Design a protein around this ligand. Structure first.
Ligand code: NA
Ligand code: NA
Ligand code: NA
Ligand code: NA
Lengths: 264, 251, 251, 264
């Protein structure tokens, strides 16, 4: 249900489909290996990061409500010890999130470069199929001439037979030239179709990966805003501590929504 | 040869087609159909092709041997022998054509059904994206008010406390609506990927059917007809036998 | 700036959108809608943008002048003056947002209607292509028989005469079915081209709506609120005025 | 209704849509000029060719039925005069058809080359948008650091003010770097969208043009088969003349179907 959970599930499906393709060039094998490693190694690290962010947020949510339950004045030394403890507990979550985002952007950026490289290759197949289509057109014309001469020499008497015995050999050669070019055009059309199908799956994988990266990045941004609220208690009035605790609690609840397993 | 390439392209699309999970019945229908086409029908097309080529090579040599010999009840002892030897191949070819068209036609119907499903999913999003936009705009307004109130110092605390309650409600609404839109978008994307593969499979299957039809037409013509005409007869038949070898070739 | 680019991209799509003829009602609906958006609504978005920027530049200078002066019934003679001067721009912005969403939502509904029409056209072809394949296969068989009979010399004349009659009937059937399939394929192609342009127009319109919403949210916040807090107040307000200039910029 | 009529009508619509595009590169202007010339000059020559093929076929259809109405023997000199007259009447139609096909293939092949050139350009925009996205990502990180230092120095006392007056200038510069890159990414996305739309219309024009070329080519092939039947009368038995006249009449009726204004 949640955006991380969906992106992960969709990426796992795209990856299985991406592995089903054979006979593709090196850039396609580059993506196949990359997505295999993303599904095997990085998506488990994203699930670990999600579990750790939620565990962290649940603990800090109760710590903040307990601070906001304080009546009378905030003892300024109790504040600092708390701010220190929270700053120490944010550090590792903020770090794991930044690391998770970096690993994700690295892998996804390599997919985009391999996709662009495959696209250049697809355009060079379009160029290739357009000379093969001309060669095919011209071998058809060549076969039209030969068959009109066969008409003509078959139209002559005994005088024709020598010329016909010759033309028979040219006709076979030109026919094999036409049948070969039809096979070559069919071949390149199939390669074009297969690569377009593959790029459709790698583009979909990268779109889902992008949704995952944007949500990891949103989680990091909220952790940074949370850090800023908490440090505005350390800068110290008991009503200011209450303002920054209240702001920090909105950010903690934002994390719980953004990193949530299930939507709602 | 086109026939050999069509088979090969059909095998690759079938592996890719089987990789997709979580699709509706109509997609499962195509997955089963293409599994059977690859397991049962393509080997029979390969057998048909071997028999046609073997038969064509034997009849080619025989027609040349006839065009070489130097008898009105000889041209009938032969024509009867050809129409005999050509009967089993004529059968395999008609069966293969009928089975191919039947399987291909079901893919076409399932594909249309999946297109109808996709348009309905797109209509479902349009109905939701409106509400999501609204919720995202309120959430934008609330994030801005949060930064402002926090900047007002203690004067902003009653206002921030009240906003914290509304923020929770709007964040839950945006989360639910995003999750719902994202789910349907994921389904549409998967089905479009699957439809690209099933359309490609069907295009290749069309080429195979066309080639199987061209072969069965040449064979039917050789199997249904009965004295210097013998020469013109053998010359016409031999032109046909040669197109048969080309249409059903392994090139 | 995004707002200026969205407008420009909307103008190009609208010229391309008006170039299409022979489309159903739902396409005509979009053609009229986008004509009015370009003629009436985008000039108003351009007017809104000018007024927002002019208002933001004046209030920015005023907020700096307040942060510079070295009176509890002065902070109210001002706040009342801002909420006054901001009221007309707050109105134009809400109207522009409402008119934009209304026009964009109708494009979305017409687009879905055209997608439903396209899937039905695709279902019509599937029903016909089967019959066309059949007719094309008979025609192939008849063209082959024609070349063969003609090769038999005078023995082939009765057979060619009979085939000439059937050939005419099959050629007329293939011609009718091809023409029908080709007509529907042409319609699908034109509508897909039109849908590419209307989707693009709507994507650009979405960016404009988002930017108009971000502006109206910043303005609403400046227009609804009321002593060293004055300093924090002016500092917060001034951060807002500056985002307003960025969101509504011409860059 | 007929395939020539439909292809022409569809090409006229695609051409109007192709002319509506502005701000595209030289290869797009190459196609705009080409399709303008196809609609202005070549489609009228295709309509003339169609009218001339049908006029020719109607006259030859009646000439062949009148020959087949001959009873008793074909006077071998009457045959030759007829064969000569028909060969003289085919020559100009076979020529106009070949010319029409050549002009069509020339124009269409230039569309395909300009399309491939536009596709190479679209892939170079994909490469360009992927460096702009990184530059944008990095200027966002740069703006995150600056705002965390502003947090920090705002956190210091009077000691902070000098450093803050400096950072204020860096923050403006980095902000203008981010706003500029967002505008540049938006700009290239719009260019990509517009070019894809244009290529969709030029691909459709070329598909319809291809249907026209295949039908012109089919008309030329039938005229060539008709020529071969008619010359097999010139090679001369009254029953052989009847065989080749009957074969020729099937080809004449094929032209009337293939070049037909209305389908059926
Ligand atoms: Na794997
Ligand atoms: Na978050
Ligand atoms: Na023009
Ligand atoms: Na024709």
């Amino acid at each position: 249900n949640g955006i991380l959970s969906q992106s992960i599930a969709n990426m796992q499906q795209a990856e299985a489909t991406i592995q089903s393709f054979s006979g593709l060039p090196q850039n396609a094998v580059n993506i196949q290996q990359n997505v295999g490693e993303v599904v095997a190694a990085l998506l488990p690290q994203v699930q670990t990061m999600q579990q750790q962010v939620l565990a962290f947020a649940a603990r800090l949510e109760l710590q903040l409500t307990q601070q906001l339950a304080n009546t009378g004045p905030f003892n300024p030394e109790a504040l600092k010890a708390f701010v220190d403890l929270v700053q120490q507990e944010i550090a590792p979550i903020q770090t794991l999130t930044a690391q998770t985002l970096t690993a994700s952007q690295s892998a996804n950026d390599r997919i985009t470069q391999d996709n662009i490289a495959l696209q250049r290759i697809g355009v060079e197949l379009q160029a290739t199929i357009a000379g093969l289509q001309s060669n095919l057109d011209g071998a058809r014309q060549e076969l039209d001439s030969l068959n009109k001469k066969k008409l003509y020499l078959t139209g002559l008497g005994t005088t024709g037979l020598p010329g016909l015995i010759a033309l028979a050999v040219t006709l076979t050669q030109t026919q094999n030239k036409v049948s070969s070019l039809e096979g070559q055009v069919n071949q390149i059309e199939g390669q074009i179709q297969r690569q377009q199908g593959f790029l459709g799956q790698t583009t979909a994988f990268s779109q889902q990966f992008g949704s995952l990266i944007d949500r990891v990045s949103k989680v990091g941004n909220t952790i940074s805003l949370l850090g800023g609220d908490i440090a505005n208690v350390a800068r110290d009035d008991p009503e200011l501590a209450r303002l920054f605790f209240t702001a920090a609690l909105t950010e903690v609840r934002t994390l719980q929504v953004d990193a949530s397993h299930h939507h709602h």
